């Protein structure tokens, strides 16, 4: 409970990057403290996490958009304020679970940025991200110019990073692009799982985690995501094993590259609770391989980690998307 006081939260912002336009006082008053990496913050009350703050962001409003049941928020701002924000920006989370001259590229603000010479693709990615993470486009030219400059710097950093780490193989990329189709169509889990163990790509604890799931499809999605997290060596074992197990599936995925996906139902109509129930069922944190998954990444919408492991990740292990916030699954 050490972060329950305003004074304690302010002290954490000692390390806060001075260039972020959102000031420590605004964040701390809204219940957030600095977790110590980048510009990641968490609420002391609800444990909601938000990152990648931009000019014009109001911490109270973002708090209510994403964490409307937080007791601190409700006490400080009132239920009316929370209902108001939820009414203005409805169903932000559910939209994440559902996931070229668009309307968003043609507002006065965005045109003003384009007319200054900002790269059009950069503007598109930055605008798209803004809408998915906040439910709205840029409000002023000063805000978008500041966000675009920051986005340019992040892209440069990403370059250096991606260029210093081992590149994803073709095989890993293929598995990643066909994640959902494989969740649906892979039924031969154990031979592949045994082979990952024998290759020391996974250990016995991790082997047990996947083998003990109670239904084939539950085992299968744990296997696939574990592969995506472990990386190139796991993808290679998967590919080689599949060949011997199911020639038709191997061919579809790695040779003809013609897998067809089709959902049995549009869960998009189910309640948020039920969508999360299904997404979370017998899913184990892919980082610690011990605790249950209990976090949804914003804005990619993936369920991959527990609450203790989330703060350690800059990017989603599944899709490599930059994580801009974390919400609890229950
Ligand atoms: Zn909160
Ligand atoms: Zn974990
Ligand atoms: Zn993701």
UniProtKB/Swiss-Prot annotation:
This is Baculoviral IAP repeat-containing protein 2. The BIR domains mediate nuclear localization. The CARD domain is necessary to stabilize the protein and inhibit the activation of E3 ubiquitin-protein ligase activity of BIRC2/c-IAP1 by preventing RING domain dimerization and E2 ubiquitin donor binding and activation. One of its GO terms (biological process) is response to ethanol. The chain holds residues 265 to 616 of 618 of the full protein. It comes from Homo sapiens. It catalyses: S-ubiquitinyl-[E2 ubiquitin-conjugating enzyme]-L-cysteine + [acceptor protein]-L-lysine = [E2 ubiquitin-conjugating enzyme]-L-cysteine + N(6)-ubiquitinyl-[acceptor protein]-L-lysine. Multi-functional protein which regulates not only caspases and apoptosis, but also modulates inflammatory signaling and immunity, mitogenic kinase signaling, and cell proliferation, as well as cell invasion and metastasis. Acts as an E3 ubiquitin-protein ligase regulating NF-kappa-B signaling and regulates both canonical and non-canonical NF-kappa-B signaling by acting in opposite directions: acts as a positive regulator of the canonical pathway and suppresses constitutive activation of non-canonical NF-kappa-B signaling. The keyword Nucleus applies. The CARD domain inhibits the activation of E3 ubiquitin ligase activity by preventing RING domain dimerization and E2 ubiquitin donor binding and activation. The CARD domain-mediated autoinhibition of the E3 ubiquitin-protein ligase activity suppresses cell proliferation and migration. USP19 regulates the stability of BIRC2/c-IAP1 by preventing its ubiquitination. Its main location: cytoplasm. GO terms for cellular component: CD40 receptor complex; cytoplasm; cytoplasmic side of plasma membrane; cytosol; nucleus; XY body. GO terms for molecular function: cysteine-type endopeptidase inhibitor activity involved in apoptotic process; FBXO family protein binding; identical protein binding; protein-containing complex binding; protein-folding chaperone binding; transcription coactivator activity; transferase activity; ubiquitin binding. BIR repeats lie at residues 6-73. A zinc finger (RING-type) spans 285-320. The keyword Zinc-finger applies. Keywords: Activator, Apoptosis, Cytoplasm, Metal-binding, Nucleus, Repeat, Transcription, Transcription regulation, Transferase, Ubl conjugation, Ubl conjugation pathway, Zinc, Zinc-finger.
């Amino acid at each position: 409970g050490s972060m329950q006081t305003h004074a304690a939260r302010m002290r954490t912002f000692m390390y806060w990057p001075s260039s972020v336009p959102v000031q420590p006082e605004q964040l701390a008053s809204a219940g957030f403290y600095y977790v110590g990496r980048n510009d990641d913050v968490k609420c002391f009350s609800c444990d909601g996490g938000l990152r990648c703050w931009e000019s014009g962001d109001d911490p109270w409003v973002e708090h209510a958009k994403w964490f409307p049941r937080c007791e601190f928020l409700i006490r400080m701002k009132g239920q009316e304020f929370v209902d108001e924000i939820q009414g203005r920006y409805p169903h932000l989370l559910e939209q994440l679970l559902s996931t070229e001259d668009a309307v968003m590229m043609n507002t006065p603000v965005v045109k003003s940025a384009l007319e200054m010479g900002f790269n059009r693709d950069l503007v598109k990615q930055t605008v798209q991200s803004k809408i998915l993470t906040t439910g709205e486009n840029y409000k002023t030219v000063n805000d978008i110019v500041s966000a675009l400059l920051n986005a340019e710097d992040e892209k440069r950093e990403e370059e250096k990073e991606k260029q210093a780490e081992e590149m994803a193989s073709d095989d890993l990329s293929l598995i990643r692009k066909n994640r959902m189709a494989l969740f649906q169509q892979l039924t031969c889990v154990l031979p592949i799982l045994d082979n990952l163990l024998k290759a020391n790509v996974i250990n016995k604890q991790e082997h047990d985690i996947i083998k003990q799931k109670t239904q084939i499809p539950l085992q299968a999605r744990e296997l696939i995501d574990t592969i995506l997290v472990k990386g190139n060596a796991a993808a290679n074992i998967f590919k080689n094993s599949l060949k011997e197990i199911d020639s038709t599936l191997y061919k579809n995925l790695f040779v003809d590259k013609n897998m067809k996906y089709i959902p049995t139902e549009d869960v998009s109509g189910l309640s948020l609770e039920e969508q999360l129930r299904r997404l979370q069922e017998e899913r184990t944190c892919k980082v610690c391989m011990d605790k249950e998954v209990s976090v949804v990444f914003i804005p990619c919408g993936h369920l991959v980690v527990c609450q203790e492991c989330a703060p350690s990740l800059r990017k989603c292990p599944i899709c490599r998307g930059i994580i801009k916030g974390t919400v609890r699954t229950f």
